[PDB]
Amino acid sequence: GRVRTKTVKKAARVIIEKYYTRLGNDFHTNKRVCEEIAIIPSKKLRNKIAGYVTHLMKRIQRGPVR
Amino acid sequence: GVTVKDVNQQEFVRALAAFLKKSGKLKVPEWVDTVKLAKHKELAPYDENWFYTRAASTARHLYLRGGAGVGSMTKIYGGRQRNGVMPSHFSRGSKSVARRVLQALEGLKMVEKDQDGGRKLTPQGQRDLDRIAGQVAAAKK
Amino acid sequence: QPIKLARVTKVLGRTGSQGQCTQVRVEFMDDTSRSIIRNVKGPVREGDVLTLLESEREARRL
Amino acid sequence: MAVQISKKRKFVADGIFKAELNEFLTRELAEDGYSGVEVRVTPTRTEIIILATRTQN
Amino acid sequence: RDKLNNLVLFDKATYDKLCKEVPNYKLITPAVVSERLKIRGSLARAALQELLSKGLIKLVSKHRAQVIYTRNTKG
Amino acid sequence: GPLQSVQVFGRKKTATAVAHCKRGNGLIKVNGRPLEMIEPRTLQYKLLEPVLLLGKERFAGVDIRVRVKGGGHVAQIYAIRQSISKALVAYYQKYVDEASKKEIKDILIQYDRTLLVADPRRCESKKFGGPGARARYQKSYR
Amino acid sequence: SLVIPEKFQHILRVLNTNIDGRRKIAFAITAIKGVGRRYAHVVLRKADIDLTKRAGELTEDEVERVITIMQNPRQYKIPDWFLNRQKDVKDGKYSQVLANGLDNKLREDLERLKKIRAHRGLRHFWGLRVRGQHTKTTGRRGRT
Amino acid sequence: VRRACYGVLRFIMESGAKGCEVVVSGKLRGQRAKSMKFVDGLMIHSGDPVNYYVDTA
Amino acid sequence: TPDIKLFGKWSTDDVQINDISLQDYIAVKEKYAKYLPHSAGRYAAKRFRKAQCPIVERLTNSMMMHGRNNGKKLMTVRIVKHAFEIIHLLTGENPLQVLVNAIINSGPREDSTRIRRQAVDVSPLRRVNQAIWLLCTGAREAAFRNIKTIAECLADELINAAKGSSNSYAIKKKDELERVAKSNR
Amino acid sequence: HRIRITLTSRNVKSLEKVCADLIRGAKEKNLKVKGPVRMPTKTLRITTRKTPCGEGSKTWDRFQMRIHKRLIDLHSPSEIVKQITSISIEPGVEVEVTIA
RNA sequence: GUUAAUUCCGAUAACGAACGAGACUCUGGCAUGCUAACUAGUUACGCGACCCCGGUCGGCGUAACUUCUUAGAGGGACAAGUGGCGUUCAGCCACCCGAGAUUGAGCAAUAACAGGUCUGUGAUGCCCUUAGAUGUCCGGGGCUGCACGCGCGCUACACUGACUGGCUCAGCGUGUGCCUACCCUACGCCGGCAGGCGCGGGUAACCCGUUGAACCCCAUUCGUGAUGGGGAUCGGGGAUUGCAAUUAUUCCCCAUGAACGAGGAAUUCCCAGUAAGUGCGGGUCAUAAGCUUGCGUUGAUUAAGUCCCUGCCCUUUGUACACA
Ligand SMILES: [Mg+2]
Ligand SMILES: [Mg+2]
Ligand SMILES: [Mg+2]
Ligand SMILES: [Mg+2]
Ligand SMILES: [Mg+2]
Ligand SMILES: [Mg+2]
Ligand SMILES: [Mg+2]
Ligand SMILES: [Mg+2]
Ligand SMILES: [Mg+2]
Ligand SMILES: [Mg+2]
Ligand SMILES: [Mg+2]
Ligand SMILES: [Mg+2]
Ligand SMILES: [Mg+2]
Q1: How many structural domains is chain E composed of?
Q2: Structural domain range at position E10
Q3: Parallel, antiparallel, or unpaired for β C35-41 and I117-122?
Q4: CATH number of the domain located at residue range(s) I6-183 in this protein
Q5: CA G116–ligand 9 middle distance (angstroms)
Q6: CB-based contacts of I132, cutoff 8 Å, min separation 6
Q7: How far is the CA of H32 from the centre of ligand 6 (A)?
C-alpha cells in the first residue's frame, strides 16, 4: 500500500527538474540535500519525497522521463 | 555458609515453624481454634499448628523488608474474596492475627518496634533465620 | 484404491463459494512427468506434498 | 496559599476562570466587537487584557 | 443413571487385592487405582502413600495436580 | 585490575531487568537469590538457556547480579533470560575480542533471537464500546 | 491402618436425623440443619478428635462428646458470635438452635410476624421476596 | 439574510483570507427550518491544522 | 553445548517422521529443538510461520481451550510434562515419537467441502492443525466430569492415536471424516 | 541560599523557553545550577458521552490536559533571582520560587 | 493497469482548481550518543546486622555516573538495498540489513433524516398555567410494586477443579473541595470480623507507595455423589454512612442450601500482545460497581481468503419506481 501521493510526486519532479546536478543516488545524502533545498514541514514527508527522488533518478539513469 | 535468600523459602517457612514449635515460647492466643484467618477465606485453616507457621512466614517477610505493620501484613495475607453472584475482589487479611503475631514475635525477641512506624527484625532473630537457612541447605544437600 | 502422494508445483487460485479451497496443480512423485489439478483445502504454499487417496479425480479450472 | 490548592485543580480552576471571564465579556460587549481576552499574571497584580474592535466604546 | 459407589475404606478382599496386583502395574496414579479397584481418590492416595512407605512401588513425580508411580525394576 | 562493570537492560512487556556484570567468579544470582529458586520454577530452563547454551566456561570470569522490576512473573523471567545474555554479550563486546562477540552472538541467535532483541509488543489501548482492545459489546436487534 | 474396622457405622443418629458415615466427620455433621461447614469444624476442634477420621470409625463415646458440645455450645467455650440464634426474642438466650428446633424457631418467627401484621410477614404470607429484591423480572420459578 | 452573508463574505475576503464559510441555519422564508450555506476560497476541514488555520465561531 | 533435550529429559534426535508428506510441518529437529514448550511467541505475524513453532509448544497452545483455561501456558507445560512422562512409562519409547506418530496417524488425508459437498484433499499444514485439535479435544472431553485426570487423558489418547485403535476420539473423527469424504468423492 | 524555582505549564515549548532563558540568566550572573529536572507529566483525562441526550451510538470524547513541571536549583542570594524572575516569562507558565 | 483510497502512472474535448483520502496531532517501539536530576536512581566507598576472604540487606551516609526512571531536543524507515513480476510506468511478492519493512487512536467532505434532545442551560418562537400555582418549599409515599415477554450483563454447572496454607510479580490513575459542610492514608493499641480509639504524612516523582493485586506457581485435603461444585432464597444477631434504612442502603458472623449435569429455534464480538481468564484505578459516591471508562497482567486456536449470506462503492444495462 505504498503509493506516493501527488504532493510527493509533484514536489519530487520539481526538485529533480531544478536540482538534478546536486542530487545523487543514495537516500541518506539526497534526503539532506532535499531538506536543505526545500521547506518540507515534516520528516515523514521529507523522507518519502527523498525516496521517490532516488527511485526516479534511477529511472533517469535508465533513460529519459516524460 | 548460606543465608535466607540463598535457599528455597517454602521449606524455610516450615523449618522456622518447626523451630518455633520446638522453642514453645511464642504464646498463641486462645482463639487459634475458632478463627477464620481472613475475611476472604471461608473456613478455618486446615493445619491446626498454623500460628507458628504464619509466625515463620511473617518473620521471613520482615527479614526480606522491614518497616511493615498490621496493615502491611493484611496486605500480604489478603486475597480473593468471592462475593457470590457478583465479581470477586481483593480483600485484606485479618488485622488481629497480624497484630498478635507481631506481638508474639516481639515477645520472644525476634522482631522489634522501629522508628518511622512498624516492625523490623532484631539481630537475634536475623541470626536464627540465618542459622536455619544453613540447616535447610544442609538438609537439601 | 492405492494411496499416492504428489507435490504441489504451482498454486493457481481459490475456488469454492466461501473462497476456502485453494486450487493447485500437483505432480506425482513416482510418475514425475505426469500432472493433475486438484482443489486443496487449507493453507498451501508451493513445494509441499499432498497425500492423495486417489490419483484420478481431476477438477475444473475457473 | 495557606489553604494550599493543588496544581491539578489549580490549572482547571484558572481555566474555568478564563472561561467564565470570556463568556461574561461575550454576554456584555457583544454589541461592541468583543473578540477575546488574554489573562497574564504577575505577583501582587494581574494584567487582564480585553481585545476588541471599538476601543472608544 | 449410573452412580459410582466407591467404598471409602478397605474391606479385606480389596485390601488383599491392592496388596496383590497394584505393585505390578506400570502406571499407578490414584485415578487409575480408583477405577481398577472401586475406591475413592482420597483412599487411593492414602493406600499409595502406604505402598510407597512400605517400598513396593516407586515415585516418579509428585505434584499439586497428580502423582505418578511405577513398579520397581524387575532385574 | 580495574572494575570491568557493564550494566545492561533486558525488556519484556513492561518488566525491565538490568543485569550487572563484573570481573569475578561464576556467580549468577537475580534479586539477591540464585537462579534455581525463582518462581515460577516451571520456566527454570528459560533462565538456564544462556548458561546451558554457552557452558559455565564462558560464564567463568563473570559475575552477574540482576535487578528486576515491573510486569508479571513470566515477563520478568523473560527479561532475566534476555538480560543475562545481553550482559554477557556486552562484556564480551567491550573487554575481550569481538570474534568471541560474534561467536557468542550467533550461537545465541541460532537457538533463539529473542535472547538479544526485544518484543516491541505491549498491551494496546482499550477503545470504547467494548470490553477490551478490539472486542466489542454484544449488539442485539428486535 | 486403612482396612474397615468392625463396628463401622455406615450411618449414625443425631437429633432423629441421619448422619452418613462414609463421609468425613467435619462434613458429615453438616447433614443436619443448624450446623454447617464452619460450626462443624469448630465443634470438632473443641472436641479432641482428629479431623482425618471418617464418621464411621468414631466411637459412641466420641459421638456423645460431639452431640453434647453441639447441644451445649457456649459452656464449651464457643464464642457468642458463632451462633445462629443470638439474643432471641422470647428468652434472650445465646444458643445454637439445631435440626428439629430450627424450623420451629423459623416458623415461630414467621407466626410472630404474621400476628404482628408487619410488612415482611405480609410478604411471607403472600409468598413474595421479603428482603427487598425485585419481583418484576427474577423469581418466576415457583410462582408460575 | 443572503445579502448580509454576502456582505460578510466579501468584507472578510477583502480583509484577506484564504477562505470563508458561513452557515445560517434556522427558519428562513416560512416556518420550515431551512439552512443557508455560503462558501468561498480555501477551507480545510480535517486533521490538526484546523486548530490553527480555521477561526470558528 | 550440544544435545538440547526437551524438558531436559527427552532427546530431539532418535525420531523418524515416517511421513514424507507431513515432514516439514512437524518441528522436532535440531534447529527446532528447544528446552521448553514455552517460547516468546510471535508466530502469528505471517502466514506459514505457524509451522515454525515446534510441535510440543503447538500442542501446549492448542490444549488450553474452553473458556476456563485461556492462557494458562505454565499450566499446560505442566500437563504436557506429566503427559510425556506417563507416555514413557506406559509405552516404553520416546514420548516425542509417540506424539509424532499420533499426528501422522491422526491427520485426516482428505475432507469434504461445499463447492452439496465435494471431496477435496487437505493441506499438510491443515491436517497437522486438525490432528492436534482432535487430540486436544478428545483428551479434554475424556477428562471432563471424571476422576481420570487430563495429564493422563492426553497420555492415554496419544497412545491410542499412535496405535490407531479406533479407541481414540481423534482416530474416530478422522475415520468418519474421510468416510464422508469417500462418500462425497 | 539553596533557592529553588519550579516552572509549571500546560504548554511545553513556552515552558522550556522560560527554563533555558533562566539557565542562561544564571550563567550570565555567574552562579552554578543543578539543571532543570523534569518530573513526570500529569495528565488530567476526562471521558464523557458526546451526546446531550441519551440516544445514539455510545460514543465517548477523550479530553486531556497535560501539565509539565520542571525544577531549577540555585545557590545564590535573593534579589538576583528576584530580578531574574521579574523578567522574561510567557503567560502560560506559572513560576514558584521558594527559599528553603 | 495499480493502490487502504477519485491513490497514482497513463489515456484524453477538456484545462486549471477546491474539499474529502493522504498530509497532520497524540500515542506505541529504538537510541549505553546529547541535556541534566536530595520529589528517581545505579555503581563504588565507609560504617552497621548476620553466615561458615566471600555472600545477603528496599540498613545508615558521601564520591563518580544517568544504563535502568523522568522528559526534552535531535535522530531513526524511505518500498531505501537486493532478486523476481509489471508498459519495466504506477506498483506487487520475497529476502538481507534491521527496535520497527501494515502499532493504536484523534481529526474527518458534499448532501441529507422531519433520527434524539424544549428533562443541560439565564439558547428559544408560540401555546398553557400564574396565589385553591404546573412557581418554590416542607412532611410522607412512588420512581423498586409481579400471572408474564424481551434486551445488556455477573455468577456458575466443577478434578484443567474447590478448599487451606505458602511463595512472588504490574500499569493506569486519584487524594484535604469557592458555595461545598464530605480527602488518600501509613503506624501504635482494642475487637473473630465488619469496625472502633489515638498520635503522624501527603495540596503530592516526597506520604499512602517499592502501590507486597489477582488468576498464576508450590504443597495439602476433597473423589465424580446436586458433591468440600454453585451460592440463590431465608432466620437471627454486630458494625459503618445519614437527619432518618422500614420496602432488609453498604459491610460483617453463624445457620438455611433452590435451580443449574455445557443449554432448542436463533444470534453476537473477534484475528496478535488480539480473543479469553484475571484483578486494580476514574466517573457515579454521605454511604457505593453486577455498570461504564481506562489500566495492566497470563495469553493462544485459527486466517493472509472469498463475494456464498448480510451489506458498501464504481461501470454497464432494465424500469410502468421518484413519500423512490
Ligand atoms: Mg495476598
Ligand atoms: Mg485535507
Ligand atoms: Mg486524514
Ligand atoms: Mg478430570
Ligand atoms: Mg423527529
Ligand atoms: Mg388553562
Ligand atoms: Mg428507573
Ligand atoms: Mg462454595
Ligand atoms: Mg440508592
Ligand atoms: Mg452443597
Ligand atoms: Mg451480525
Ligand atoms: Mg449507570
Ligand atoms: Mg426488460
Answers
A1: 1
A2: 1-75
A3: parallel
A4: 1.10.455.10
A5: 29
A6: I55, I58, I59, I62, I103
A7: 28
